Design a protein around this nucleic acid. Sequence first.
DNA 1: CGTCGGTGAGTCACCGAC
DNA 2: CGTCGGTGACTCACCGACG
Lengths: 67, 67
Amino acid sequence: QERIKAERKRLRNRIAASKCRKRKLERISRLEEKVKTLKSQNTELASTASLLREQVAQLKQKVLSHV
Amino acid sequence: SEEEEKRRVRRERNKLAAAKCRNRRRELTDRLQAETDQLEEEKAELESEIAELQKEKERLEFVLVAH
DNA sequence: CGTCGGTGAGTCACCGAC
DNA sequence: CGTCGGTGACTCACCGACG
Ligand SMILES: [Cl-]
Ligand SMILES: [Cl-]
Ligand code: NA
């Protein structure tokens, strides 16, 4: 009789432990995925900025070739 | 007992391996979270650099068409 | 006041490495 | 070719939340 109220608590904790473990692993996966895309995105932005830096320079030169 | 000592030290070595598993997972989460925060600051600064460069580029283009 | 769920921690069962 | 450590999962200890 009182062993059932204790089986039911172990079940509830079993569910809470499972949910807890899962969330931990989900957080790791999210972060690993986010790092991956941020590394890619920053490499594309970094080259976009290099190209712009050269276009601005060539433009500063073209302004002085006309006084 | 003597089998009670083999079981006791086995429980001790495993207790430490469990703690190492849990600590490695926590240090991994810390590492990733620290890395994403840093990559998000770099991305923001690149997006900001690109925005200023696009502005500067268009000012110069319009300065240049004014003879 | 007392039970809840979240989470740290110890334990068991199991497995691959070596 | 028998111990070792790693790990998923059950369980307990402990805590803050709170009806
Ligand atoms: Cl619980
Ligand atoms: Cl062992
Ligand atoms: Na499960």
